[PDB]
């Protein structure tokens, strides 16, 4: 509902999740989904500490 | 021959040189030469084909 200002960018730690990246990525609302060192379709075939 | 150390230094040198070259060769396999990662499985699981 309300993101933090640019200069004071908030952070949140994500842990023990199951990340359904593919269902998020294929959504139409994201105007851009650039990724670096990783590809979006592969994201489910991965797991990051 | 029994007592003196390094009596066979030349054969030892040959073996050491060969083993050292192989050890370097396998070690180089760990370096990524600027790539994203040094494991092909990691790259293939992480990145799209192109």
Curated annotation (Swiss-Prot), chain A:
Outcome of mutating residue 27 to F: In strain: Omicron/BA.2, Omicron/BA.2.12.1, Omicron/BA.2.75, Omicron/BA.4, Omicron/BA.5, Omicron/BQ.1.1, Omicron/XBB.1.5, Omicron/EG.5.1
Name of the coding gene: S
Effect of residue 24 to I: In strain: Omicron/XBB.1.5, Omicron/EG.5.1
Domain of life: Viruses
Lineage per the UniProt record: Viruses, Riboviria, Orthornavirae, Pisuviricota, Pisoniviricetes
Function: Attaches the virion to the cell membrane by interacting with host receptor, initiating the infection. The major receptor is host ACE2. When S2/S2' has been cleaved, binding to the receptor triggers direct fusion at the cell membrane. When S2/S2' has not been cleaved, binding to the receptor results in internalization of the virus by endocytosis using host TFRC and GRM2 and leading to fusion of the virion membrane with the host endosomal membrane. Alternatively, may use NRP1/NRP2 and integrin as entry receptors.
Name this protein carries in UniProt: Spike protein S1
Effect recorded for residue 2 to K: In strain: Mu/B.1.621
Part of the intact protein present: 345 to 393 of 1273
Assembly: Binds to host ACE2. RBD also interacts with the N-linked glycan on 'Asn-90' of ACE2. Cleavage of S generates a polybasic C-terminal sequence on S1 that binds to host Neuropilin-1 (NRP1) and Neuropilin-2 (NRP2) receptors. Interacts with host integrin alpha-5/beta-1 (ITGA5:ITGB1) and with ACE2 in complex with integrin alpha-5/beta-1 (ITGA5:ITGB1). May interact via cytoplasmic c-terminus with M protein. May interact (via N-terminus) with host bilirubin and biliverdin, thereby preventing antibody binding to the SARS-CoV-2 spike NTD via an allosteric mechanism.
